């Protein structure tokens, strides 16, 4: 339900830049990661009293 | 170049579940996060001598 990454372009990146295939579960993990980053972004934006999720609401520095 | 998240479905999630709009830069951050997670997955898979990026190669526990 609701794949949130562009599967074809992820597979293309991983193949072209890394010489690797991409498992189905890899796509699932990436999609779930996007969902969590979005929900956490909602939490951050609302806590600031805003109505728009902004780049500063997507905390990805631990990457 | 190469947006790696499904922009329409991200905006739909953020609006429907959080009542928020989604800025253009939010989409950019999410896309760059996916790119980094994929490249790091390539590093992990190759270090294990494999030819396929697997779910265990996408380290997202810091979420």
Residue numbers in the entry:
A (entry chain A), B (entry chain A): 2 to 64
Can you quote the paper on this entry?
Here we report that histones are major chromatin components in the bacteria Bdellovibrio bacteriovorus and Leptospira interrogans. The bacterial histone Bd0055 from B. bacteriovorus HD100 is structurally similar to its archaeal and eukaryotic homologues but, rather than wrapping DNA around its outer surface, binds DNA edge-on and oligomerizes to form a dense nucleohistone fibre that completely encases DNA in vitro.
We solved the crystal structure of Bd0055 to 1.8 Å resolution. Bd0055 forms a crystallographic dimer where one monomer is related to its partner through two-fold symmetry. It has the overall topology of a histone-fold dimer, as well as a positively charged ridge along its ‘top’ surface that is also found in archaeal and eukaryotic histones, where it is used for DNA binding. In addition, the α3 helix in Bd0055 forms only one helical turn and the remaining amino acids pack against α2 of the dimerization partner in an extended configuration. A conserved histidine in α2 (H49) is conspicuously absent from bacterial histones. Finally, the surface opposite the basic ridge of the Bd0055 dimer is more acidic than that of HMf/HTk histones.
